[PDB]
Design a protein around this ligand. Sequence first.
Ligand SMILES: Nc1ncnc2c1ncn2[C@@H]1O[C@H](COP(=O)(O)OP(=O)(O)O)[C@@H](O)[C@H]1O
Lengths: 457, 170, 258, 254, 159, 335
Amino acid sequence: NEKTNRRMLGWLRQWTPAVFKEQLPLKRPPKKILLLHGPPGIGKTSVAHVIAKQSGFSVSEINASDERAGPMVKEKIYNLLFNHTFDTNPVCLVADEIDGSIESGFIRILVDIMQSDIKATNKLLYGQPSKLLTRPIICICNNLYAPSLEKLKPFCEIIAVKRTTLLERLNLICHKENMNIPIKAINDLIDLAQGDVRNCINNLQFLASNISWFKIVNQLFRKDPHRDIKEQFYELLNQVELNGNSDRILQGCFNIFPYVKYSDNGIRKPANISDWLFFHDLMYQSMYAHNGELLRYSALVPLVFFQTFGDIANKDDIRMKNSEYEQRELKRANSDIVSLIMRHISVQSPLMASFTDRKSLIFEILPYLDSMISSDFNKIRNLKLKQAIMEELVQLLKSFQLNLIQNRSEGFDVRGGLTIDPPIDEVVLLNPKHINEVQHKRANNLSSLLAKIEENR
Amino acid sequence: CSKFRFKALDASNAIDRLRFISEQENVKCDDGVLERILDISAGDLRRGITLLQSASKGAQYLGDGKNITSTQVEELAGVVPHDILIEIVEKVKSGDFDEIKKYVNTFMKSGWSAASVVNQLHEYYITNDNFDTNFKNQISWLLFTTDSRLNNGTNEHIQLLNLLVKISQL
Amino acid sequence: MLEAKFEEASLFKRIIDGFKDCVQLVNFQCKEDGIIAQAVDDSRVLLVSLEIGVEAFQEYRCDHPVTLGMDLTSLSKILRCGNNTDTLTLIADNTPDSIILLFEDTKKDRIAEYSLKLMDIDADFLKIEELQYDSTLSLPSSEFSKIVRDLSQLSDSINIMITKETIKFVADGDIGSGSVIIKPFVDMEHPETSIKLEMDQPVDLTFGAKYLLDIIKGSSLSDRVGIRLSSEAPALFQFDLKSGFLQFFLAPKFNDEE
Amino acid sequence: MLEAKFEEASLFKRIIDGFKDCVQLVNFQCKEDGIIAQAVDDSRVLLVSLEIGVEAFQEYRCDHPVTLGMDLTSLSKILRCGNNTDTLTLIADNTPDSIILLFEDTKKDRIAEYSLKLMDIDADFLKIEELQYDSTLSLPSSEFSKIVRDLSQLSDSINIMITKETIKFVADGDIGSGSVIIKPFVDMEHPETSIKLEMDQPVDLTFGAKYLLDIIKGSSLSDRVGIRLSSEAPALFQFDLKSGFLQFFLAPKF
Amino acid sequence: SKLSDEDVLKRLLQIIKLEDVKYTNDGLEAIIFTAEGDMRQAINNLQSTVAGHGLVNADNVFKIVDSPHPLIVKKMLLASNLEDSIQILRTDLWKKGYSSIDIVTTSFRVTKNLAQVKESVRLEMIKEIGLTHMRILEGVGTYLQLASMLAKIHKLNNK
Amino acid sequence: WVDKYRPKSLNALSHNEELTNFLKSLSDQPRDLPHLLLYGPNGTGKKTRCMALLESIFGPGVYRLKIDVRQFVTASNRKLELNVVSSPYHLEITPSDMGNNDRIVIQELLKEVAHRYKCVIINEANSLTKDAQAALRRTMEKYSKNIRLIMVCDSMSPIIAPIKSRCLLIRCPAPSDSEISTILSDVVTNERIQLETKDILKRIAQASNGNLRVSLLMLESMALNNELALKSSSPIIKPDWIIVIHKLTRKIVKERSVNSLIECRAVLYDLLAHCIPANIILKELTFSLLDVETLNTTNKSSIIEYSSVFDERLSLGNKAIFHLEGFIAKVMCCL
Ligand SMILES: Nc1ncnc2c1ncn2[C@@H]1O[C@H](COP(=O)(O)OP(=O)(O)O)[C@@H](O)[C@H]1O
């Protein structure tokens, strides 16, 4: 990334007139913050440190993910930006992992400092007869499009670090320790350390004295044509066993297998794997009932995916997600809504509660109740029949204890949508096309039903 | 611990207790009722006593002064009548998948326990001396598999339909 | 409106200490002749009933009864600001969403004021007290507390048996059995230590020890405790106040019923 | 049979407080010359041994010794009914399944009576006390408690070292080290505060602080504590009673 | 890493020279075979054999120490005919007091670490060893279950 | 509506006269009454008959009931919240409202509760875990003079044998199409519906498969579409999930591939996320796949075998989609 490293150095040299009073209203860069983004382990932090030191700045690093007290940190950042350090050298602030700050405190403080400096500069330019930012700020993220950074981006100079720099650093350490290491062995050490700089330096020191579950899932669908299938199988078995998280690996395999290319005859391969997956579910249920002796067999089920679906065609890494946690939380929320409706029926309908099972309520009663509420009353020309149906629907809303709430969360005084509480809609409406049609019809019906409920009150 | 195995209480070793319970409660029944009750109990004196109490209540409510019949006992015990079982045998012997499926859907409307239907079919098929031994091995294994699947909380309709279809292909 | 000023915040704090733990919701009602309050536990085996007459207050004004329900825990959380010697005034309008507790020291100095959120409870005060009970007895409340604290260790059930001139508390459980037998007696050297007993019919009832333990708290409000038992109704344990009383009605165990 | 009446239930309650926590099962035996009791902890490093002579009671009758074992926890659970001033009578037949504790107030008024279930324990009383110990010392028990409470914070081991006219308690652990040095002295202004020491041979033993902490409880029974140490046997810490004593024998470390 | 045969043999020879023990080549070979690269276990077995019989001979070592449990299990699973495997399971394992749980678990380990047969047949044998296990853990652990497991493994190996 | 017209006594029942007479016989002497287990198809009217039997054992106040709440503490600080349907003569518990914590609620509540006795109605006894049933096994026998159980279930298959023996078994056969038609006739004459021809009511029965709860609800749903006047060719109102399952079977018989298996898994996820049990999904899917006339007997036999196998799998597993997708893939491989 030499071009990127020269751009960073060029941006830090634009601070030189303001900080060092050297000749290349304060001639500062238009963008006062440098924002570095890119993959982990490529040296973002190391490049920020080296270029800041090379430019004559003292480097102060803050991890933004660990500092869960922006309002307090505030004092640290204000001292580091505006107070003279005892060091002869001006401070450069390096903020690492700024995308990890779940609490916008750190970013709000930086935005407040930038806005205060813009107000102070405009007063110096236009003010007829306020702490100015005299120090550079470097911020490092993994993700540029993180919601927290949206307010900071306009003040930032954005620099992408793409995927050598570790090899150059390790060579410089070898040369300073008088170690004659062949460049091949340093590459093999980098590959062993997976780009961990700390692990690399420790392994080098030891020489001188003398698998993410996702990566395993993608490896389970890959066959190398140049290695024995048995050696690959034992290597994968050892990696699955060392990880101890066989369940997450299998859930990964389950989400990936439909998208994987596998020579297909009749999609039987999937039928054989449903029986294993069922075997895993029985084994996982038995782990809570019996002392975990059965845990040794849990590593075998992921390896059936390597045997059945492993192909040379699968060269690209498929990214994955956790639909199950979202489905479990949604199933919990829907079960809680249904449990609340069942309690409401028990309090009002003395007999209905005896005939209503949870399943019959979800599949039979609630879909019909919603179809009755969503029915187009605008097609009914007979006012008497419209009034009678509306009186029966008000009686049904009362039997199920369904409250019409005016959600006034619109915010702009136009059409506060009426919503049913509890929201039966989230339990019954499975089809996204039907959701939009039903919402438009319901809005006119619910206003008529609310007016009738108010008339009855 | 010393292992004490309690034996199933069939008609032979429990007819005395059942007759004592019937006499102590003035349960006026026919000749082959009590022995039949335990036959439905399949080695369970508690279920037999419960069935006897139910039959006595049903006979005291009527007040006709007659004796309890084996048919009245097997009616409230969940036993499928003989004619309904013979209809199932006819549908299994002669009939295709569609007719068997329709008759099973109709039979599941009338509430019967699938375990009792499987037991009655097993008794009929193993007891009848009109089927080949090769057919008998297969019917025994199929009934065993169906009972083992039903003993796990499965859907009675699907298991019964699968059993009848598998034994119809024989 | 509600306007009741207690001379010492301490009295109210001890009263609430009595409802504490054993009940969650309390329904108060102030009126022309004073304040009453009722609370029933979830299992419905214990009813805590309070009555404070107008004379128990330093100042009381009521031209319009007000009923208000609240969470007991929230109330006690706030009930440790009385300094005991502080003055406490309970205040509420005729249609309240809150109850105001106002603690003030003699001098204008420090004024602690709270605004407690109320709960809506269907007004349904019970009137389960009997005309006559099978047996009636009173004894020092500290003595009753000890009796309960002794036996409690042995079982979850403590039986009270009454026969002519004899009161016997019994517990029997795993580690063994215990009993405390007391006899009626008049002590002129100070009659607040006497043990009275009026028996119209021998009684023998069992109560859940966990509940009797909740009830003994009333010792802090009165020197003596009155216990009224009947085979027809919940037992009544009563702690008299100056103009008022705190009552605990406890349903006997059927065989298993607290 | 067992029939022992304590003037004040308090004495028995404090005695049991001494067995409390550090042991689970206690084996009592009443006889013609009094009551004895022994309890050994699970690891077998501590023996608690009691002796109460006939004169410590207000009334004692024994025409036939009775041995009875019981759970200490069950006993203490019941041992808070004495009002301290209540009278306590221990009662049991010659072949008991239970032990009866009877607390009564002076007047006929209130009578709390308990029937505690007994445990069967193989009778095997130990007689590990020595004729002579390397060194013997006594000092106020409150002082001994403070010494133990100080050092305990520093380590799980407290060393006791004795040389001519010098007693030194030492603890050394993570945060640092501590020591308490005391010297023999006769205080005539009140000799219950004196510190006596008779040394036949210098001693240096280490004990587990958790155990010394259990032992200090005896302060509530006596003003002074006697400590006898030997390199040949468990150390003896003794708390005298009026006609009796509570003894704790503790095995040194390695 | 594991200690090769030469290193453990040299250490045992040094210990024998330092202790003046009567030994023989086959006895030391059996000791090293039962050690499986475990020097501590090797020295412990040597000392136990010395204190129990005095002479370190293969007969004594085998009568006091057990032939590596996994090797008999491997020979049982690698059997070509069903009757041979059944006789091995009956005589070597079942008639000597080896519990069914140990047999099935040792069986799983042997298979997982097997290299004579292919991957798919190994996975099928592991599946059969594990379905049985699911029955062994439920309290149905008997000789019939292990016999059925061996029969299913042979049926899988029966093409 | 189903609730507006429901029998409240034994003399108000209008089908299964032999069952009504058996219930009257069983309620003639109410104190010497053993525990009862009502089993049969879902929607037959067993929950109404149990309440009608209670109305014969006790006064008419059995229907005046109230809903309360009770809290429980498990081995951890997770608080179990359970609502209880209570009456001055009986109480109703539904252990199907929680996970594996049925045993705690069952044992504690029944021990606290334990004419002269108070009836207990266990709703949906099929969801009772085996441990909860084992806990109830001895509670049914130890307290038989104060607590009598009336367990309502749809199939005795998951009920253990000890519980089956510990209570009388009462079967409730689904009412005939004629009785359903007669009930719908009284309903439409009371609700003032207009029928051009009576036979439509029969068709309603033929669309309900003995279910009265579904029959009345569908009749009322189609009465709102025809504006209180049913014609000779009024369309049959089918639930949304049934239409989704039918479209799923059409997709199955039309395309058999992995790309279609992905959208099948998506449809299964959308169905499971909206409070639809997987056993009913599998049952309806298999039954409507057997109705496909394009397949032959060889395909239907394999389909029913795979459905039984995967039904056993689902009854032995917890991740329901893991078995549903496997069954769908096996059916795709069969066709
Ligand atoms: N005796 C009866 N006569 C007429 N309709 C009845 C009778 N018993 C029940 N029903 C109705 O038939 C339907 C049966 O469904 P449901 O009540 O849910 O069954 P269950 O009582 O088994 O839960 C309901 O509409 C119910 O009110």
